[PDB]
Design a binder for this molecule. Structure first.
Ligand SMILES: [K+]
Ligand SMILES: [K+]
Ligand SMILES: [K+]
Ligand SMILES: [K+]
Ligand SMILES: [K+]
Ligand SMILES: [K+]
Lengths: 78, 78
């Protein structure tokens, strides 16, 4: 094993380490992005479910009003 | 100047390092694929909830026009 070949092996491997560290940094940051996205989506789901609950309530209320008005008309017909 | 042995160990160490960092990036890659799947399902859920909210919107409008008609009927009778 000649010292020149060894020194070049070291040079190459060190380049490699730097490269893969860059790639890992990239992946880590991307990971944080995906995580943020998951958070926002989950929040959006919670909001949508609150909206859905609100709609269920407004509609049930309207159905009871209709039931009442229909009942009234029923009385004005008999 | 560095010993052929010294160089051999720097090489040893660097190779261990590369293998380590590669394992780590593999881990991150798989974790990433997970995050993307998760995001997919969440977005799909958002689609279903928005469809449901649309359905509730239509039903809401139908109940409101029905309500208005009934009010009108009550007005014409008494
Ligand atoms: K070598
Ligand atoms: K290499
Ligand atoms: K890390
Ligand atoms: K060295
Ligand atoms: K090292
Ligand atoms: K890669």
């Amino acid at each position: 094993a000649s010292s020149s070949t060894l020194e070049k092996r070291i040079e190459d491997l060190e380049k490699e380490v730097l490269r893969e560290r860059q790639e890992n940094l990239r992946l880590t940051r991307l990971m944080q992005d995906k995580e943020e996205m998951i958070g926002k989506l989950k929040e959006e789901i919670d909001l949508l479910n609150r909206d859905l609950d609100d709609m269920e309530d407004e509609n049930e209320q309207l159905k009871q009003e209709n039931k009442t008005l229909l009942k009234v008309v029923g009385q004005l017909t008999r």
